[PDB]
Design a protein around this nucleic acid. Structure first.
Ligand SMILES: [Mg+2]
Ligand SMILES: [Mg+2]
Ligand SMILES: [Mg+2]
Ligand SMILES: [Mg+2]
Ligand SMILES: [Mg+2]
Ligand SMILES: [Mg+2]
Ligand SMILES: [Mg+2]
Ligand SMILES: [Mg+2]
Ligand SMILES: [Zn+2]
Lengths: 52, 77, 191, 189
RNA sequence: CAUGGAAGUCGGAAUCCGCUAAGGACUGUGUAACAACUCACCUGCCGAAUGUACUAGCCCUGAAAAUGGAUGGCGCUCAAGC
């Protein structure tokens, strides 16, 4: 098992992210536009699917 | 307490909205016990609050509990 | 649209000295000395008052003015580091296989080296060497901590990121395998 | 901003009718504390506070109704209130000073003075001894009651109280904070 | 109303008033049920702007073919481009 606080710390770096719908890039949780140039800085973002 | 007749058992499983009561000084008389526990500038504020407090009962006949309290035309006591 | 005058100010406490020459900044105080080169930015440095440094840009564009605030905080970071230092903390996160580290001392030079063993039960021994001026310690306050401290924020932070980026899980669901070493707190040595 | 209009006429009407105005400096005091003093002083005097009146008292200075209003302009800085009353200065000097509350710590609150627990018997259930062992306090259970044999320093004056100690301060009924009404200088007294 | 138990927060149906500058018969978290906690709303600090929706200029994404290669060539960036 993993201590509850440690599991929260690790999840911040690889679980709470936004995903672009055009180039599958990882984005910050509060982002509004993709940062990559090959997708044209698109603003079609979706949350990262949770584990359940 | 001012409810339609008795609240007989095994009758509250279905809708129990048959609690209509009359709107008169009987409800106003019961307001004197509280006596405006929190300020309210004596029973004058409490009477308006208590009158509209029974909003489910919809007062008596055509008159509505909100209209009586909203219309400041009745005597203080 | 070009802006005529954009200005910022940096206060200087009465403990250290700073000197700028040919856009090369040298900051020296009680805890040491640092240098930074800013020859790639067109900025005019000046002495506003007895203990205040001013900097400004004339007839700049929107893109050029943006760098003005970036320069100010970088120099402020240098002042903080020489009088208060910096301090980072890291934690170990494992489910089954314990992670073993060995922070051996100076290797005939100022550099520290960190050895990481038994990551998710692998036989690699993986080695990272820290930048000079950075000291790595095993904490005694509580279990599973790495403490990094130094004078410059850029060196301390980049070295800490080196350790985090080296412990990676491949060909697995990373939402389930949360193994690794992560940073958890940032602050100064003093207070 | 319907209530905004109601503030303008209310402020100007009440200031002129009462010749005596008293300024009160209340800061970080629980709302219930003002509730009781409002009810206690309900019969005599009305207390009313709002946002700073940058031009609302300055408007009272323009007309010659009170040449002394413009003398009181610079005294307002922030979170300073006014009291409208008709009573004597001496009777209202300490009237609003009642009900000083005992504010507990908030997990890190700076204690102005060193706080000490005198030796004695807590008298509480001995299942809570784990809280004492967190700070490493030497405690002996006597007759089912936790007893502090030797005084242990909690936190130095001016230092942040530990989160466990701050919670521990609640059941011991000891805290460094006492919140009460603040009296500011009024009318160059 | 509901009830081994539901005190805003299983659920069903209503939405008033006191005190105020402001705090909802409440958006969540949470208790067997209370509590505790968050939000909403208002106040203290600062010093002049801020928010949403549309129009069209240059530039960028959309833009994958077979011998080595063509604004005519070199080269050009407050142009030697529009
Ligand atoms: Mg697989
Ligand atoms: Mg093109
Ligand atoms: Mg060509
Ligand atoms: Mg071409
Ligand atoms: Mg030509
Ligand atoms: Mg030209
Ligand atoms: Mg030509
Ligand atoms: Mg031309
Ligand atoms: Zn993208």
């Amino acid at each position: 098992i993993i201590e509850p606080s440690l599991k929260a710390l690790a999840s911040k770096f690889n679980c709470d992210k936004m995903i672009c719908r055009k180039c599958y890039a990882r984005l910050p949780p509060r982002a509004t536009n993709c940062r990559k140039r090959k997708c044209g800085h698109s603003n079609q973002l979706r949350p990262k699917k949770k584990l359940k | 307490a001012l409810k339609e007749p008795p609240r007989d058992r095994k009758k509250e499983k279905n809708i129990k909205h048959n609690k209509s009561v009359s709107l008169d000084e009987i409800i106003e008389i019961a307001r004197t016990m509280r006596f405006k526990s929190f300020s309210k500038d004596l029973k004058g504020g409490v009477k308006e609050i208590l009158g509209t407090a029974f909003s489910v009962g919809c007062q008596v006949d055509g008159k509505s509990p909100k209209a009586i309290s909203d219309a400041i035309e009745a005597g203080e006591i | 649209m070009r802006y005529i005058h954009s200005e910022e100010t940096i206060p200087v406490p009465e403990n250290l000295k700073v000197s700028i020459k040919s856009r090369l900044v040298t900051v020296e105080g009680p805890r040491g000395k640092l240098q930074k080169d800013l020859s790639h930015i067109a900025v005019n440095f000046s002495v506003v008052k007895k203990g205040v440094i001013g900097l400004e840009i004339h007839h700049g564009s929107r893109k050029d003015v943006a760098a003005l605030r970036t320069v100010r905080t970088i120099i402020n970071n240098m002042i903080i580091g020489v009088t208060k230092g910096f301090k980072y903390k890291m934690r170990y996160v494992y489910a089954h296989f314990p992670i073993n580290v060995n922070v051996e001392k100076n290797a005939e030079t100022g550099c520290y080296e960190v050895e990481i063993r038994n990551f998710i039960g692998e036989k690699i021994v993986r080695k990272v060497v820290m930048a000079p001026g950075v000291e790595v310690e095993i904490s005694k306050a509580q279990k599973d901590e790495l403490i990094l401290s130094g004078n410059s924020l850029e060196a301390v932070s980049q070295s800490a990121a080196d350790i985090q980026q080296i412990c990676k899980v491949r060909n697995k669901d990373i939402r389930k395998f949360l193994d690794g070493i992560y940073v958890s707190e940032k602050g100064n040595i003093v207070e | 901003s319907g209530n905004k209009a109601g503030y303008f006429d209310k402020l100007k009407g009440l200031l002129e009718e009462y010749p005596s105005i008293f300024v009160v400096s209340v800061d970080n005091v629980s709302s219930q504390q003002m509730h009781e003093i409002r009810k206690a002083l309900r019969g005599q005097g009305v207390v009313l506070m709002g946002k700073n009146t940058m031009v609302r008292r300055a408007l009272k200075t323009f007309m010659p109704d009170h040449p002394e209003y413009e003398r009181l302009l610079p005294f307002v800085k922030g979170n300073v209130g006014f009291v409208f009353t008709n009573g004597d200065l001496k009777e209202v000097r300490e009237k609003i000073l009642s009900n000083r509350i005992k504010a507990p710590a908030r997990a890190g609150a700076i204690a102005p003075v060193d706080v000490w627990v005198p030796a004695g018997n807590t008298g509480m259930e001995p299942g809570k001894t784990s809280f004492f062992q967190a700070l490493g306090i030497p405690t002996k259970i006597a007759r089912g009651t936790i007893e502090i044999t030797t005084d242990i320093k909690l936190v130095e004056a001016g230092a942040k109280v530990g989160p466990s100690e701050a919670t521990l301060l609640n059941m011991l009924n000891i805290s460094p904070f006492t919140y009460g009404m603040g009296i500011a200088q009024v009318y160059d007294q």
